């Protein structure tokens, strides 16, 4: 019956307050829907304040990112889609229109005044029991390299819809998996390089065979070189100081100086000469380097690189078969890279250096010939999203139906369940489960289909036992995924659903929102 | 991170300030050991500080 | 540093290896007194070095 | 006066308020802040979530967190807040309860002190009611079962412990994991651990089971100059607080140069520098390097074909605590560099967690540590945050049940027989004094209310019954059923949690309501 909090505090211990929740998670549903399916249209992220920058997306991801918000329930399913990006790809639209749903869900429930436990218990079990269903149903592959490289290809295929890429599709997708054939079983993501360089078409876009550096050559390098024996290096070069210090030139004359100077040039020359021992028709210089080192590698004539990033010395130093060396006392105890030719290439209206039949292949550059700034960051967005599901998909061989059908599959478990189950958790389940069946209706309302009919034939399909059923999306149509092609991860689906259900069990256990009194700005 | 010539004036023109305020506290130094792996496209950052606060920045 | 004024003037690396382990010295001979003395725990205003 | 005046410097800016119905004032707060808790009592408890004044989302259920972060304008709001952090410093959840009972006992004092009593009774009232109460709950209190070997009544403690938060949802491993910790970090001869012996590190993606114990080293760096092998085996280490470089004394140098002798005479130090370091460590017979102030990339090369795999840049207690796990020695500088005292590890790994950047080293020691550290999987920020202080809560309940004879019976029971306890101490007793008491076990019932409450069935109807069965039964222990499961009793429903928690609580809260009870007057400025 007393103010107690300070001048901008607010708190509201009613259902205002999950209203209020409510409304925001909506509003975040609704922004969302239209970005998926095949169907699905991109949407503008407009600045003012952040002087007229703009991106366009599809994957909600960046929407997310790029908005905020007072209310804390929809900064909370940002960081929700935050995760779910951080862990494999696509699928932030899924779990977001999803909990969307699931609230929807709530907010009928609450309209019959039902303790949530009883709501959190149930979706606790049909959580459990789903999981429990689609892994008994997890389909795994790899035995076979045809079979594998197929799986691979409807993965690729059926994401690709879900962006805009699909009007290339057999020029990505394809494409895209050889990418992660380059990794060889290694688990890491950052050696796939990305490019983007506007001008051309998508289609213009290639994979080339090899290997490419964007920076500045010294003053006198050689334009080509074949064989080239590689050294990669990180260490002064730039008059190379002696990392001494607290020590002083302290002296009577300019003849000592001068031989000082004459001495410095002669050290310089030894360290160019103790590199050189080793032996090498190519050098790879980090940094930069100086005027006299030029000159002297000039003198030897050799192909030096400078100013090179560390990241990206680190992927060449996998590629070519070298690594980076700092000191040369052993011409002996180094790997040297190996590549076929290093020439000149002119890409864009930007200069390249081309690694061509380089030894090793491991590492990978997608370079991007867009039309536009936009479309190439949306398009960089989208390879990296797909190469992430790739090497999940190698990762874990084990796959799973889309187009519904383990959705359904699921779905049609949790009803069976609920029927097997008394009390209101049942129907509570039962909306849970129609809370499921939302989802591929929301794919269906992307491709504005029959969408009753549609649901009724699926569920029908899967009382039947029919566990292949799917929903056409060339024509409208039910079908057999089997037949078309339409496989997904086996992880990305099962920690969808998992998020979802950690996110609703947070969300939904929530009684009073305090926004403190705002600092200032 | 010595080598380009703007940090190479910048340290120039405050070692020359030196000769002028012997009462100010001047610090150079590799940022490497400094601060791990710090970011070689962030240089040459002024920093002013006093009893530990940032008064000042003036940063790359 | 000794008062935060002294000066240290040599001519050759050996030099400046002596003085550096010369300080290391000093360091660990105030430990080895203090270690010998029998002293189990010690306390000071001022900082204790790593 | 005949003149006006003033004595005080913007008298007419500053208020002041004073009498009994200045009293009122606090307690009408006294609702607000109680009012605002008793929403989350229950291991079916409904949690808070709430921005700071920067824009930060926290959930939480307990209520030193809750109270801390939220925007306090008036004082007894913020001695509030100091008191539910207080109760967090010596237990953890049921600072909700603190704040409960404490207000509850506030509105009762404000309901009986219209009669007209002196409130220097209410206090002595409620301060014997208190003490008779404590006296009587240590007395009923039994033995706990501890030890090495056995568990499970501290499984089923944890458990409950856990049965106020979210951590609720997988509720079976983070109890086992949690008594393993303790069990393992703990201190034998003293009964006491230290929690900076225990470090908690939690990454984001994965899910709630792949929660682990690893009585080992967890370390977010990887293996310096990467383009080495991401892994070994059976590793010993030489652990540095000194760079890879020629060093510079404290005291201000000059090396006066005048020859090219000398600059020589320079070159030939900095290589025999660096490489009689390589021999050093290389030749004492450790296989891992570990650097706390980093190092040169020369240094990093020479490690690198010597095979000698190697770290650097690391915070000063994790090394401190891998020391420890490893059980070798930190080693100062060269000079005192021992073989004796390396250390050997079981296995050393990076892990990349698929897509990100970020590797951290995990590190199985060859020998168990006293040190144990806990890693975190799941798929959000504030559930990992909720985790974090829900394990942290487990942890201090582990060790304050570390100690026999300690264990009693919740479940909103307790309370009960303390207030028969109290009731028939105040029959034992004059009037003009029982009043107080009579107040003291009205606010004891009132937490089993607010759990039924919390519950969403019938509260009043049901805690009567309940209390009527304690009566009339030989069960002392029997509370709620607060989760479809049956019976009443709480030797086989297990709510399980420590008596000193209990006894703190109780005490703590009827020292604030005397703090409360014993001001009247506030001079505050109003501009």
Redesign the interface.
Same mark, same amino acid.
């Given at each position: 019956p007393v103010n107690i909090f300070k001048a901008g505090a607010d708190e509201e211990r009613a259902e205002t307050a999950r209203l209020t929740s409510f409304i925001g998670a909506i509003a975040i549903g609704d922004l969302v829907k239209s970005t998926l399916g095949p169907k699905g249209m991109d949407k503008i992220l407009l600045s003012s304040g952040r002087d007229a920058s703009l991106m366009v997306t599809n994957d909600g991801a960046t929407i997310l990112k790029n908005i905020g918000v007072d209310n804390p329930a929809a900064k909370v399913l940002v960081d929700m889609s935050r995760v779910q990006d951080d862990e494999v790809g696509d699928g932030t639209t899924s779990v977001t229109v999803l909990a969307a749903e699931l609230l929807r869900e709530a907010e009928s429930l609450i309209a019959k005044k039902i303790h949530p436990q009883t709501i959190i218990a149930g979706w606790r079990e049909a959580t459990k029991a789903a999981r429990e269903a689609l892994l008994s149903s997890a389909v795994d592959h790899g035995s076979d390299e045809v079979k594998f490289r197929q799986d691979l290809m409807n993965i690729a295929g059926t994401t690709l819809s879900s962006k805009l890429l699909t009007h290339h599709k057999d020029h990505f997708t394809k494409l895209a998996v050889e990418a992660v054939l380059r990794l060889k079983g290694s688990g890491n993501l950052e050696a796939i390089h990305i490019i983007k360089k506007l001008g051309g078409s998508l289609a213009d876009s290639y994979l080339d065979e090899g290997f490419l550096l964007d920076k500045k050559i010294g003053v006198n390098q050689p334009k080509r070189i074949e064989n080239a024996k590689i050294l990669i290096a990180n260490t002064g070069m730039?008059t190379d100081?002696i990392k001494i210090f607290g020590s002083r030139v302290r002296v009577d004359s300019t003849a000592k100086v001068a031989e000082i100077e004459h001495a410095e040039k002669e050290k310089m020359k030894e360290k160019v000469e103790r590199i050189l021992k080793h032996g090498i028709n190519c050098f790879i210089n980090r *940094?930069?380097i100086?005027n006299y080192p030029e000159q002297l590698f000039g003198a030897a004539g050799v192909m030096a690189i400078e100013h090179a990033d560390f990241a990206g010395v680190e992927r060449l130093a996998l590629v070519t078969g070298g690594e980076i060396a700092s000191t040369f006392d052993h011409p002996e105890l180094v790997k040297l890279g190996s590549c076929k030719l290093i020439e000149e290439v002119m890409i864009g209206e930007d200069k390249l250096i081309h690694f061509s039949g380089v030894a090793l292949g491991e590492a990978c550059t997608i370079v991007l010939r867009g039309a536009t700034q936009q479309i190439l960051d949306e398009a960089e967005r989208s390879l990296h999203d797909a190469l992430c599901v790739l090497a999940q998909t190698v990762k874990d061989s084990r796959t799973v139906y889309g187009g519904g059908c383990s959705e359904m599959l699921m779905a049609h478990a949790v009803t069976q369940l609920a029927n097997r189950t008394p009390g209101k958790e049942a129907v509570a389940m039962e909306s849970y489960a129609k809370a499921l069946r939302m989802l591929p209706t929301i794919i269906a309302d992307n491709a504005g289909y029959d969408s009753a009919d549609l649901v009724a034939q699926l569920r029908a399909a899967h009382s039947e036992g029919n566990t292949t059923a799917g929903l056409d999306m060339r024509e409208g149509t039910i079908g057999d995924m089997a037949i078309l092609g339409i496989t997904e991860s086996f992880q990305v689906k099962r920690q969808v659903l998992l998020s979802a259900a950690e996110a609703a069990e947070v969300i939904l256990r929530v009684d009073n929102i305090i926004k403190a009194a705002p600092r200032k700005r | 991170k *010595? /080598?380009?010539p703007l940090c190479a004036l910048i340290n120039q023109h405050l070692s020359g300030l030196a000769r002028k305020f012997p009462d100010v506290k001047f610090i150079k130094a590799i940022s490497?050991?400094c601060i791990?792996?710090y970011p070689?496209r962030n240089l040459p950052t002024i920093f002013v500080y006093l009893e530990g606060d940032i008064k000042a920045q003036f940063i790359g | 540093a000794e008062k935060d004024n002294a000066e240290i003037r040599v001519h050759t690396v050996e030099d400046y290896q002596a003085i550096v382990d010369a300080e290391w010295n000093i360091l660990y001979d105030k430990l080895e007194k203090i270690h010998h003395s029998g002293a189990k725990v010690v306390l000071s205003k001022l900082p204790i070095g790593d | 006066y005949g003149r006006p005046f003033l004595i005080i410097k913007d008298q007419d800016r500053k208020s002041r308020l004073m009498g009994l119905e200045a009293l009122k004032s606090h307690i009408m707060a006294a609702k607000a802040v109680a009012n605002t808790m008793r929403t989350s009592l229950g291991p079916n408890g409904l949690d808070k979530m709430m921005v700071d004044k920067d824009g930060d989302v926290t959930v939480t259920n307990d209520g030193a967190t809750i109270l801390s972060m939220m925007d306090v304008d008036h004082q007894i709001a913020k001695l509030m807040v100091e008191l539910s952090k207080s109760q967090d410093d010596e237990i953890g959840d049921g600072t909700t309860g603190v704040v409960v009972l404490a207000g509850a006992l506030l509105e009762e004092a404000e309901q009986l002190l219209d009669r007209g009593i002196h409130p220097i009774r209410i206090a002595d009232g409620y301060e014997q009611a208190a003490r008779v109460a404590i006296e009587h709950l240590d007395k009923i209190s039994d033995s706990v079962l501890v030890d090495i070997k056995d568990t499970e009544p501290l499984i089923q403690t944890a458990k409950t412990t856990l049965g106020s938060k979210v951590v609720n949802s997988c509720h079976r491993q983070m109890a086992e994991i949690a008594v393993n910790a303790v069990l393992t970090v703990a201190d034998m001869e003293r009964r006491d651990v230290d929690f900076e012996l225990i470090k908690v590190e939690g990454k984001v993606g994965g899910r709630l089971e792949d929660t682990k114990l690893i009585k080992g080293v967890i370390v977010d760096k990887d293996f310096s100059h990467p383009q080495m092998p991401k892994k070994v085996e059976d590793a010993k280490i030489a652990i540095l607080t000194c760079?890879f470089?020629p060093p510079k004394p404290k005291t201000k140098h000059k090396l006066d140069v005048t020859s090219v002798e000398d600059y020589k005479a320079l070159q030939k130090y900095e290589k025999e520098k660096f490489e009689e370091m390589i021999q050093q460590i290389k030749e004492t017979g450790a296989n891992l390097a570990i650097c706390q102030? /980093?190092?040169?990339d020369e240094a990093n090369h020479l490690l690198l074909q010597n095979n000698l795999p190697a770290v650097?840049?690391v915070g000063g207690p994790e090394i401190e605590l891998i020391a420890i796990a490893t059980g070798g020695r930190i080693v100062p500088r060269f000079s005192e560099l021992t073989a004796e005292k390396l250390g050997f590890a079981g296995l050393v790994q990076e892990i990349s967690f698929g897509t990100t950047k970020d590797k951290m080293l995990v590190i199985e020691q060859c020998k168990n540590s006293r040190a144990v550290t806990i890693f975190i999987r799941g798929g959000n920020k504030m559930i990992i945050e909720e985790a974090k202080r829900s394990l942290h809560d487990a942890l201090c309940v582990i060790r304050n049940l570390i100690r026999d004879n300690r264990v009693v019976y919740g479940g909103g029971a307790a309370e009960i027989s303390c207030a028969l306890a109290v009731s028939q101490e105040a029959d034992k007793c004059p009037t003009l004094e029982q009043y107080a008491m009579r107040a003291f076990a009205d606010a004891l019932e009132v937490i089993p209310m607010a759990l039924s409450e919390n519950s969403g069935m019938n509260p009043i109807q049901t805690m009567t019954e309940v209390r009527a069965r304690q009566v009339k039964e030989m069960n002392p222990a029997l509370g709620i059923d607060c989760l479809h499961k049956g019976t009443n009793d709480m030797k086989q429903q297990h709510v399980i949690e420590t008596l000193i928690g209990k006894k703190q609580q109780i005490s703590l809260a009827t020292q604030m309501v005397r703090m409360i009870l014993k001001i009247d007057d506030i001079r505050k400025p109003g501009e």
């Open positions: 730039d100081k *940094q930069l100086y | *010595q /080598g380009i490497t050991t791990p792996n070689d | - | 760079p470089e102030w /980093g190092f040169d650097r840049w």
